[PDB]
Symmetry: D2
Subunit: 417 residues, 4 copies
Amino acid sequence: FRIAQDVVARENDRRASALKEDYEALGANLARRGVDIEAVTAKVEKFFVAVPSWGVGTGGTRFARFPGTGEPRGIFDKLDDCAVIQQLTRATPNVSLHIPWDKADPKELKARGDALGLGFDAMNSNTFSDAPGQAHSYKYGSLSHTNAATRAQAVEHNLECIEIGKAIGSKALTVWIGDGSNFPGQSNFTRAFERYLSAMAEIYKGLPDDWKLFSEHKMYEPAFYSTVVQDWGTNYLIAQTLGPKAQCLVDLGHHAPNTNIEMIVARLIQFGKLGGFHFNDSKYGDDDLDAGAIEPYRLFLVFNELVDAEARGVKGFHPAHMIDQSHNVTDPIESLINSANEIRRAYAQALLVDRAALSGYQEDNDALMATETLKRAYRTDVEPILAEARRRTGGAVDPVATYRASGYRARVAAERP
Amino acid sequence: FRIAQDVVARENDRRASALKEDYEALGANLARRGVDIEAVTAKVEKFFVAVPSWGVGTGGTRFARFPGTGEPRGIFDKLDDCAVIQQLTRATPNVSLHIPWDKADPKELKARGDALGLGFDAMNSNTFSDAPGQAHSYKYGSLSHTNAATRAQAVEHNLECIEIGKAIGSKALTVWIGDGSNFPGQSNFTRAFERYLSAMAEIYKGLPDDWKLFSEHKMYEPAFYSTVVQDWGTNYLIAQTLGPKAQCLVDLGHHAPNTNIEMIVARLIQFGKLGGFHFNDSKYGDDDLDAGAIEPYRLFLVFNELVDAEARGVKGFHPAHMIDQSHNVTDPIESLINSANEIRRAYAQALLVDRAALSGYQEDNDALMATETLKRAYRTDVEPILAEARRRTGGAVDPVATYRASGYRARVAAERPASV
Amino acid sequence: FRIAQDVVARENDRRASALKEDYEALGANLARRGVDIEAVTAKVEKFFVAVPSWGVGTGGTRFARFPGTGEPRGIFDKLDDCAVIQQLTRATPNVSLHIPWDKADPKELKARGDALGLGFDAMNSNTFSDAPGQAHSYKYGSLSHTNAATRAQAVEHNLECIEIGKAIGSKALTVWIGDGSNFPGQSNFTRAFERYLSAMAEIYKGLPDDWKLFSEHKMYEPAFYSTVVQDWGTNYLIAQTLGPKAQCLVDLGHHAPNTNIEMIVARLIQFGKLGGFHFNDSKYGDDDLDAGAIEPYRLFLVFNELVDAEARGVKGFHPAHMIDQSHNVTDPIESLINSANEIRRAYAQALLVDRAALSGYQEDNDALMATETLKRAYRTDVEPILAEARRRTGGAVDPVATYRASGYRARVAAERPASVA
Amino acid sequence: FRIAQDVVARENDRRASALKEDYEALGANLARRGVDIEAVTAKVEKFFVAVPSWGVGTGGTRFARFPGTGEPRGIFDKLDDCAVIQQLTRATPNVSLHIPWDKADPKELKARGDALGLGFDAMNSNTFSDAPGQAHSYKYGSLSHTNAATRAQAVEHNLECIEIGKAIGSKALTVWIGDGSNFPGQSNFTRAFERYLSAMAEIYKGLPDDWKLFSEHKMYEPAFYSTVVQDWGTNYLIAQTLGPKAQCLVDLGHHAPNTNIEMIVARLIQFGKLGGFHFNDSKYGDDDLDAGAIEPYRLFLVFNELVDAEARGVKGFHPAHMIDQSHNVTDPIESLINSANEIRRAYAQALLVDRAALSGYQEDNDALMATETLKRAYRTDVEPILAEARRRTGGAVDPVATYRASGYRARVAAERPASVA
Ligand SMILES: [Zn+2]
Ligand SMILES: [Zn+2]
Ligand SMILES: [Zn+2]
Ligand SMILES: [Zn+2]
Ligand SMILES: [Zn+2]
Ligand SMILES: [Zn+2]
Ligand SMILES: [Zn+2]
Ligand SMILES: [Zn+2]
């Protein structure tokens, strides 16, 4: 236990009475609306989202990085910190690894995970930066590089990520590359894409049949003119071309300004290529801010489509859920705690939508009541449900408050001078 | 002839000396660059773009419309005006019609076109507005409307456009609808798209063996929250789902801010679904401004992809070209003339690109020289080539100048009563 | 009463029990948070936003307009409909007129207003479209037109708006024009703005002592290359140049993609030039959608700045709030009703923010708790406060439900003839 | 000379014939247009833009940096490389320094510059990152930080930048900070701006009377929610507030999507606050790409506003011109060479505009001929003028060609340490 159980129990008891009052009131309110709060809490406590090992430490920009105290010094420290997030929120039992940043004896990683009560989500390859001893540079690309030997090297790296994953229980490989161009003419759009598809086909050939391959589109950065996998349209072509095991991953901050992302989510679901999500929030570009901190309604609307798919009869629908954020000016652990909470919040609210009523308003083209139907769910303060779900599962009623009362940050600051 | 042959000849003679000098000078510059100017001219004279019947009349915004003088009223007035653009530019032999706006006796339409030396490009359906006596309103959608009878009516209208097109020589139907929602929850994204696909499948069934069906995506407007056919991704799904005769149409101003449009073009080409292009320019949204008036380099880059597709003989590459613009503050005829000119200008420049050198710089990852290889082409003033092509084919050296010297606008202003 | 009181009473009685349970539950929660729900409700019931006369009629785009039934035939019908919104929401006692669309004898306008219990907010001039018998067209502009005779015509029109406003009780004139260019080179940016400043200086001379002149910026549309009053920067330059009576009006959907609108509001307030705010929502451009329907958090953040100004003891700050929307696919009256509710919703939430704690988190650079402090307020469902505020002031617990129960739309549908040409 | 004079001579002679043909051909075309090519060439060879000392090395993103061969180790190597750009293009006689990156003995800097034929442009302070042994961190801001001692430390740094500049011949200080917030509520927009203004006032007081203080606005990055100096509006307020010596710096890639940047330039000129420009190109955000590589027409339109002013008299109008780019996938020297060339290209084309004709089409509202009047100039290939200007002033006809023929990159690669990931 990263956080002393006595502290968790102490901070829960301190807020137990108020929570009971809020939960009961909400329970009565939902009962008046024909909803059993218990049924919602039950689903909420089972909603999980993977935390990024690379978000456990303070992030930075091309201009600077401002580390705080007790910065994790490696993957093992990072797992220790991730365990705090899980213990308190109970919403992040799995960690997403990134190779080579997190390279270490896989057996030891799995060992530290089991001890901490953490599992591992999809693996993440890295051919957007050069590692020491690398024969070919990814300066001008990786999986779509003009040099055959460079593409082969990139493929081998991804195959190595799969091997690592198999040793720790991972069942998927996420591939995001910076491949693209900064100048018109620098790259031939079609040939670069053909090269990418050929290299991804090789990775697919080496992909275990009990694994999935997620390709992640991004409009720009690091490439500032064109990017090979620029949007969901190219991403769909990729997944469809590679095979059933290949699906698309949607990072919320990777779209052009004003994009209707919830529609992209719906389209991918309809054609069975929605592999999963990379949650975060943003205002300008791929800001990688705490989920729901800028546009909480958009987050709700994305979950509205996920829940709608279930309501529509889509069977065995279980897209992968992962947080992909950068914490530049806050305690990384606190931001991850509240981000996971925010994701559960949007999910909970989506579960409250009166699907029958919404359906009737859509068929009758009553736009005002249709949108109001979504708002009645979104406006509902589900915090009592999120807190109770945590309390009932070993977490904290108020995670950040408990985290600070524990003095964990000061603790690791002393341990990690 | 809409414009007196004597005036065209006269306005050409007055500018022949300067054109001679510039063409020969450009010819020498290109020769030193290993390019035969005549070869470029040969291709430029064969590039055509369809003019929209709805473009020769003054356009407007939701706030107002400020008509000029001699405003064409019926499709007959419009064809007469479109004939001016073709005569002077020789780059717009075909006109794109819009139903019911241009609804008229097919036989009469065909006869008027033949008499003016004009053909007809793709038909354009209209289920984004209500016509008088219409049984079902398209307020809440058309092809994807929740009411079956409404979708049936929309489908029938499109089938009618196909019948009209067959009678006048058209070989395609372009479908752009405003279908979408203005509020979250108003529409179920998936079911709306299912209804759309189902209705489009019916239209597809009415397509003759040699016809194409073009679906056109648009991010927003008139729908301000979601749009069924919002982007090229959804558009590709439509084309792929419907079949070989279904392809995607790319309207330059229908993309999210900062979108790399030329890439979308390349992607559609690779997968054989680039049905055609709707040319115009823009800065903020679907501004529908004169092609090349805002971002001429972007236009060149789109053409760079088109010329490249040709150079490598890509399978199924044969997009239709059409201008889709609104002229709110200029003489519609002059704007279409110069827009058509800019389109040929961008094409001509793309033809100048040293493909062999570019390929080399691309393979060696010499980004600087690669972008410079494109710039050397784009920076070249190809006006002499465009002008000489027009001169040799019955057009005007300086189209707008000849148009103004002819006094055409004043002529039709006298024949067409202004509202005030 | 446009809506029968017995209908309002029956619908409120039908929802009394649920309202009581929710309001009291929320009240207890807020109490535990050290907040007096009574104090909030008292301020909410007093927050008003003007309704646009042109908003009760169905709107459209350049592609088409799909009118509903009972479209108002004129200003008098529009006033009648605005009376409905006010009666049910009690948040819209003042109406904003647009000339020449609402032109009519001022004495009659005033008479109908008083009869309905409505007042009049800022006047709105129209030089973005041509009126009949107009000696000069506004095709190439109005107040910034190259032709002096055209600018003079636009000035005289605005002066007329001021005269009408004076007779009905208005105290401000809002000026939004489409002036701009669609092509590079078409206009000399500087000279066009200089011409605009000249015309506005003239309009300014006709302002009574207690009147305000509001200039409204817009990035684009109807102009698609450049716009004279394109952003808040140019807008500030205008207000500062004209004088103490000149201030800037911020319309939510008039900004470039991703703009931080709430910051612009803070800036204008800091320099005493925030005249008013036109409320609406949008996702792509100037969509003019129902306020809070697309980005409710942004609306809350805008109010956060408004409330913070009062928190920083800003002096002489009395912004004019107005709804400026277009209802293309809904009953205009219903949308204005829920939009006004949304606006009060965001205001209520902003009042819930613990400024003391927030200021503390800001000082210590505790970004996480600072943003959470705002979220604790935004996440709060204040609907019971909004409903109780309505009940107390003679409004409806559920405005739209009550509106539909009254059969108002079908009633006016049989009294108003649509257009046939 | 960084590049052997015989190499420059040989590479010019090899292209002299074709250049003569192109220049005379263009000369004849311009004559037919009533334009004297000699008058244009004379102005072109006198147009200069400062080069960023930090743009000489390979740039990177937050994801990675892929340095090339012969990366400059310090300011002295950077100066040596900037000398290549100036010798070959003759358009970059001054270098802009960044402190503490280029911290060095002022006398050695001045000596090296004088020996290389290079001067120094505006100084650039750095309070957007922490340096070793720094007492206070700029993590939560600098000039607007909530901590008084942190603001004081930031102010002192800028004053030190001024001292260094006075010793080497600089006459301006450019201030760009990342100050802002990543979360709503983290910062109080108004208070933070007030702190920024107070700190800048202290820097202004220490500014020599013959110097200029340039504030640079940026919409976002590194701050991802709000930025203190986010746009030209706030920037104008800063400059006007600080005083006559304070002006606004416009960086092309620092504006919201679809912003009409050329209008901003016009507005700043109109109110005498256009301090200067930071040239670069972009498609998505502050991409910092080679000038004119993405939107050459936008670059021309900006120069159109500059030349219009230049032509319409406007005394004492000497905006500072600087290139601010990051070269992540090309030889930094080559990109700066072609970028400076592109900048002169836009200027030359702007000089070709028939101002009288344009004025006429604007006053007549002949939008089409107005835009075509600009296009006639923009469509003209002025490369012969740029090349001849270089040839006549000791530069190279084809800069990059000569640069490569000289084998300079291979040369410095062998004189400098190898770079790592
Ligand atoms: Zn991601
Ligand atoms: Zn990302
Ligand atoms: Zn179109
Ligand atoms: Zn359009
Ligand atoms: Zn407005
Ligand atoms: Zn507006
Ligand atoms: Zn800069
Ligand atoms: Zn920058």
